[PDB]
Amino acid sequence: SLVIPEKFQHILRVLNTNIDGRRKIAFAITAIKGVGRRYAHVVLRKADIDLTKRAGELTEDEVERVITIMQNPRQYKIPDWFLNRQKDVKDGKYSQVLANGLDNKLREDLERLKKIRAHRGLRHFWGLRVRGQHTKTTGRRGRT
Amino acid sequence: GHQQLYWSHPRKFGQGSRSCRVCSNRHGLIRKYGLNMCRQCFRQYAKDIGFIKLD
Amino acid sequence: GRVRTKTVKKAARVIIEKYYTRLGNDFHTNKRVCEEIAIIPSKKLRNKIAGYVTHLMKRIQRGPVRG
Amino acid sequence: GPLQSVQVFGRKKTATAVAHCKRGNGLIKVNGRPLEMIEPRTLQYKLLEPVLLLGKERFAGVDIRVRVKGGGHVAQIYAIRQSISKALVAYYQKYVDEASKKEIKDILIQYDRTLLVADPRRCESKKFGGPGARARYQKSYR
Amino acid sequence: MAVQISKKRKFVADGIFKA
Amino acid sequence: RDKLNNLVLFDKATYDKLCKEVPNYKLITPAVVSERLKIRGSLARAALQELLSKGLIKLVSKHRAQVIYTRNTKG
Amino acid sequence: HRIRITLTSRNVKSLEKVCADLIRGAKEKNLKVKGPVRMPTKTLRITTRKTPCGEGSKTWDRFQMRIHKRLIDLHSPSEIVKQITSISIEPGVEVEVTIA
Amino acid sequence: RFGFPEGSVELYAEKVATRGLCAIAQAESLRYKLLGGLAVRRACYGVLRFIMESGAKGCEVVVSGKLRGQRAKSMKFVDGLMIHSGDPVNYYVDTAVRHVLLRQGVLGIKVK
Amino acid sequence: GVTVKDVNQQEFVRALAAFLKKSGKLKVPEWVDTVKLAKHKELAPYDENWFYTRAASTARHLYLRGGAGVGSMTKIYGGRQRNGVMPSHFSRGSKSVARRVLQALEGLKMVEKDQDWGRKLTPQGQRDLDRIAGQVAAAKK
Amino acid sequence: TPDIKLFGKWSTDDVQINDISLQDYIAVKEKYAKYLPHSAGRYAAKRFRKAQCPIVERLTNSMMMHGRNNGKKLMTVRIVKHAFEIIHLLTGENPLQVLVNAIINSGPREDSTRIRRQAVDVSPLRRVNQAIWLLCTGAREAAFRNIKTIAECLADELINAAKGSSNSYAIKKKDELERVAKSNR
RNA sequence: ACGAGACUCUGGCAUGCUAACUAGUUACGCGACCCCGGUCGGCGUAACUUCUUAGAGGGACAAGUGGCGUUCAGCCACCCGAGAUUGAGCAAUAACAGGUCUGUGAUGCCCUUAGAUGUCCGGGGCUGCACGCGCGCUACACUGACUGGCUCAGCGUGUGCCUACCCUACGCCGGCAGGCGCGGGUAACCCGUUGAACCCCAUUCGUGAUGGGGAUCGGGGAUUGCAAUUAUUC
Incomplete structure (x- = not known):
């Protein structure tokens, strides 16, 4: 009490x-x-x-x-809007992903692009930003 | 073939779609009060429009 | 930083040598005289002159003036 | 009978705060809610300045409906700090003998001149080449 | 006027027409 | 630098060192308590109105930032 | 019969004249003429860079085009005022006469 | 051009009352005396004298371009009295800025 | 005798919330538990029954200023849209969540419409609002 | 009340400007006595208009600093409330006397200046401007990244400066500003 | 003599003027409601122009005074006073090898002129990224962040010759950005009485990179567009 x-x-x-x-x-x-x-x-x-x-x-x-x-x-x-996986490419299942799965579901969204060798995929493999950032000024102590 | 492929831009938005009334240049159009004037010409000929630097 | 100019000092000296009669010690008496004895397109230039006039009208009563 | 109406304004900044007087009781009100609960209550005593220094016999028969618009929060307080003071002082000009108005003015000259005379201060016009009026951008040398 | 040009636009239209 | 480890709720002896000895202090404030008795500062804000509902301490002026109390009266 | 004579001028000497001379003269004809109603200024602010190119320092213009509006209240049919108006017309003011 | 009815527009012309005072009415004087092809050292001092003939307070005639040689020259012809600053720059002095097209270049005519 | 305005405006919503805990007749819509109150807000409101607190507030935004439409009730509940790294700007509330209070206080006869659109706190409502002010403005003597 | 104008609840009289050096340059009493710190201002138009300002207002002005808290006198008029609420309940003295005690026993009596820099005496108005700024930074250096609130840190600068304790930031500055000056005089 | 100042425009004001259902304010008449008497941006007018608007003159000049200083210019501290250094434009002679020929149907002379360096239409680029500079935003919190609540702004813009693309109230569908009807407004009239933010008010979090911090990234959800992947923006 x-x-x-x-x-x-x-x-x-x-x-x-x-x-x-x-x-x-x-x-x-x-x-x-x-x-x-x-x-x-x-x-x-x-x-x-x-x-x-x-x-x-x-x-x-x-x-x-x-x-x-x-x-x-x-x-x-x-x-539904309150969930993180909505109209899912893989299973078509609606859920909020937990600790064991969150390290998996993003990692499977990489071989979604990595297998097909996508422009969006290759930038993840190298260590760039993919959602339209500028790299001329950014990534000083981040990249070697 | 040439004639349909001569004016094939959708010419209803963008600084290239619109044009200057003095010079036909596609930069610095005064789109306030529909002056629609290249800012370099506005400066010279605003004296006889009525725009005067009183302050 | 209120030093009188040459269109204020000389303009005052031209009045006093001509019009010793119409002027006096008080400002508001000979502020309004400058409407008659000067054709000035400026309220500000009038007070600058008519103000300096009185400062010299206190100097004909204590000694002579230079100009 | 004969009326005793007075309309007086007061200004600190862009706040335009007008009081309306008559004959009445000990009540001073500003857009409905009276002087007591006009938040912010941090500046509580600022509207008690033209009351505590004088008392409710100066406001024996003065009913002050204050209308306020424009300005800010402190700018509106210092508008009606001033306006209800001048609303009281201007009321003692024409509906009593002149020496009644003179005695109570000197209570609010000796305290703070803000209570009667407005401040000429306004927001200065911003200039090109900086983020304020008297301020420039950091220019790059070297 | 049917289009009904504004009085901000009027002295601008008066202005450019002259200029 | 020097990290400090505080406690969520009371120990039995620490309430006997609060309820007896904090009314022997003068500044009864939730910043005094969580530096002295070393608790999670959020707690000390709640404990003092239970003592007002018990009827020991005097609410001088409560605020969002600082709530100021004092020990028992003289009469 | 409320005639509403809109007086919008770029200049003050003509806005004073056109409003006054349609009252000063309209006192002698003895019709119930009112004073000119005021409208606030509209300062058409176009702030352009002085330089055609992007070099030198950034000296900005502040092109101020103030425009004003007046109207005069009346109890008059149309023709009575029309006899006064078109005599002695000057370039400054745009006289848009309202019947209703 | 501007979409006007017929009957409204009617265009008249006069001589300018003492036509030596208006700057662009005497920028035309230095336009078609230099396009005519008289040396700048004579066609200006005639029109500078023409306003001391017309009783002008002063002048500021600046004729700027390729006057003998490839390096730019600018001759300034000033006498009488000319104010430059304040509000009276509006309702005393008159701006004229004109471009003459000679075979070599363009000379800026500033009749002030 | 008084209006609502001769009382402290802060604890006055705790007077009209003391009418809505009394009530339990409000016919609340079906989205309350997990919802966000505006596009700038980051959490859910800290109150268990925040709908009873804004219904206690919206009615005393109607008597103070009458003719409050839904797009004005978006405006009244707005703060800083703290956009992380970009400069923060002004946000409106939400078009529906404030509407679902103005559509809620029509059943419980408190609001009314006239010409020029918008809600107004009905003549019955002013009588319903003044005498909960006396309930709160009693205890400060 | 025209009898005596109490600072909300705080004593206008029983306030002694004890330092005869700073006798003229701390306004607290009878003419400059106000209910709050907060006034219209106009203590920054001319040179010696600053000394006529009440020290309770000068302290309030000297807290709203460090950019984030500039233009927040609404916030720090309230600090000077909560600061004063503490002082009569810890020390048991008049807080406005404690503030005058906090400024008298903080303002450094000399300061070194370059003409190895050379020591000369300060103005009394220099000590008013210094001491009011000194203990506020002590109430900032204490209150930053700290469990304690402003007003207690504010009080632990005013009370420790009222006593001559060497428990405060401002007292160790007055100690060392006079010690730096002691060497190169 | 020009430049400086004077000048024009503005900031502050005048309970004196000038005026006004697009600005109001007081009065009464009537209703909302109050316990004899108020509160309400709800109705109508009967007066007035204080607020509001912009017309006109007026007002401050170092003028009153105490010193200062050859007692000359002037400075200073007061005094009563809305103002006793409010600002900005405009800007001399003389020039610079300063910058734009990519603003001009300003342009000399050249280089191109069907193998185009003209032009038109798609696709890309203009963003690319080991890196070194510059201008700024947002932060490192306890004066804060968060959640409710309370309450006041001032510049202003808005239906377009070409021209189409406007401002948005109010009402319906939906948690959201947003989708759909009836109206106003070419505007002191409509959005808007611009219920601006900050702080103020009260909850809550507790010296830990936490509820500080909001970068990077995944899946949806609409709009704008003729189309956005190299995420437009939300």
Whole structure:
């Protein structure tokens, strides 16, 4: 309540990363690669979670409802514009991609171009900027 | 073949689409108050238009 | 930085030698005389002259004037 | 009976703040909400300057509907800091003996001349060759 | 006028016509 | 340089070193507490109105930036 | 019968004249003539670089073309004013007479 | 050219009252005396004298181009009195700027 | 006797929010939980029921200035569009989220339209707004 | 009230300009006494119009600095509130007396200048301009990247300068500005 | 004598003038609502021109005074005063081998003139990138960032000979940028009473590169366009 209670978890692994449980519970999900603040305001909105009291007082049965809305956002009252993969080239599946997948789904979007040897693809292979930056002035300590 | 391929630019936007009324040059047209004047000619002949540096 | 010019000083000296009568010590008395004894297309040039006149009208009462 | 109407303005900057007077009670109001709750409340005492130094017997029978437009936030405060002061002072010219107006003017000359006389200051015209009026761009030597 | 040229445009049109 | 590690909520003894000894201080401010008792500064803003709802300390002038309280009265 | 004589001038000496001379003379004919209504200035600001090329320093022009508008209120049929107007016409002012 | 009706437009002409004062009415005088082909040292001092004949306050006649040789020359012919600055540059002095096309180059005629 | 304007304007929305927690009759639209309130804003509003706070604000933007259309209610709730590295400019609110308050306060008889378009807080509404001001303007004595 | 014009709640009297060197050049009392720092200004038109300005306004002017906080007197009139709120609740003294104490025991008595640079005495108005600028940078050097707010850092400059403690930035400058000058006089 | 100043235009003002349903303001009449009396940019006019607009003169000249200084020019500190150094244009003689022949149907003389260096039409380039300079924006936070809330601006522009492309209220569909109707406005009339931002108000975050920081990049979603990949812009 006011004092540091029992069952205090200093370190969790909510989807395979050492997470600090002292942060605001919406802002505690920033550590996981693929969810920052915006997706983490809304995952802990869909469930009846007051987020003023910190993650020194939260349950290990609380995270049963959490990850189902994180892994399957679509079924649990989360819109389409609010997802990161929309009208997907690969599967045609709508989802918000998590830490294990985010390192994969971009990497598969490279061999989408790398295999076909695309102008957009070759600039990733070399270490240039691809979305129409100017390289005459930029990349001083970035490139060798 | 030549005649259709003689005026084949969509001539309704761009500084090249419009032209000067004095000089027919495609840079520095005063498109405020529809002067539509190459700024070099505006400077010379604004005295007899009414534009005068009172301040 | 208010030093009188030659169209103010000389213009004042031409008045005082001709018109010692019409002028006096006070500015507002001989501000309005400059409407009659000078044809000036400038409100600013008038006050510059008529102001310096009074400064010389205080110098015919303490000694002579140069010009 | 005979009327005692007075319309007086006050200026700090581009704020044009006019007060309207009559006979009435101890109430001073500025676009509806009176002097007490005109935010910002950091500058609370600035509109109490033509009241606390004088009192509610100077405003015994003066009802001041102030209309304000133009200017800023502090520029509007210092407009009505001044306007309601001159609205009071101009009211004592024509509806009492002259020495009533003279005594209460000297309370607001000795305090701060801003309360009656407006500042001539305006935003200076920006010049070409810099980002402000009296400022130039960083020119490249070497 | 049917096109109804403006009074900003008038003295500009008056201006260029002369010039 | 010297990184400091603070705590989220109270220890049992630290509230007995707060609730007894912070009313023996004069500046009861959330910047005083998180330098002295060394907690996450957000906490000390919330703890002081519970003590007003308890009825120890005096709200002089609350602000967004700084909230200023003082210890018990004389009478 | 509100005649609304629009007086827009580039010059002040003619805007003063055309407005005044259609009242100063229209006092002798004894018709209920009003004073000239004012409209604010429109300073047509075209700020051009003095240089034809892009070299030298950046000395800018500030070409100021102020334009003003007046109109005079009346209780008059059309022909009464027309007798006064076209006599002594000067180049400055654009006299657009409104009937309604 | 400008899309006007018929009956409205009617074009008259006079002599300019003391026609020696208007600058572009005496830039024409130095245009068709140098295009006629008299030396600049005579066709100017006649027209400079012509305004001291016409009782002018002063002159500033600047004739600038390829006067003998390939390097540019500019002869300035000034006497009387000429003001340059202030607001009275508007309603006293008169601007004329004209280009004569000789076989060698173009000489700028500044009748002021 | 008073209007709303003789009271502190800040805590006055907490008076009309104290009418909308009383109410629960508002027929709110179907997008509240995850939505963004304007194109400049970066988060969701920090309130659980922010729709009850702006409905408590929009009505006291109608009595202060009458004839508030939807494109004026885009304007009233605008801040800095902090564009990271580029200079920040002015943003409007959002065309629909403020509309869905002006379409919401038509059922609960508070707003009304006239000629020249736009909402206006109805003569019934001024009577509904003055006496929650007295509820708040009592406790400061 | 025309009896005595209290600075919001703060004492106009029981304020002693104790330094007879700076006797004329700190305005606090009876004519220049105001409810707030914030005035119309016009202390930057002529040379010696600056000394007539109240020190509570001069302190407010000397905080709104470092570009981001220039043109924010609305913000730092409020700092001088919260700064004054602290001082009678820590020291237990008149904060406007503590401000006069903060300027008297901060303003450096001499300064070295180049004609190895040569030491000469300062103007008293120099010490007003210096001390008001000195402790504000001490309330900035303290408050930057720090847990403590402005007004406590502001108070820890005014109170430490009121006492002669050597606990502040401004006191170690007055110590060393007079020490630099002590060597090359 | 020219340049400087004077000059013209502006900044500040005059409860004196001049005027006005495109600017208002007060009054009453009436309604919204208040507990005898107010608040409302909602209706109409009855007066006036304070605010607002721009006409006209007027006003400040180192004039009053205390010193300064050969007591000459003038400077200074006051004094009462909306203003006691508000600004900007305009700009002398004499020139420079300063810059544009790619602004000109300003142009000499040359180089091209069907193998075009003319011209027209596609596609690309103009952005390319180990790098070294310059001008700037946004930042390194606790005076901040964030989320609600509160509240005031001033320059201004806007339906086009060629010419098509305007400003946008208000109402419907949609979280978004945006898509669709009825009107105004060639404009002190319509957008607009420009509910501008900052700070102010209250929440929240806590000395950690964090909620500082917003670069780089992926997938969508529309607009502009005849078309945008070498992401237009959102």
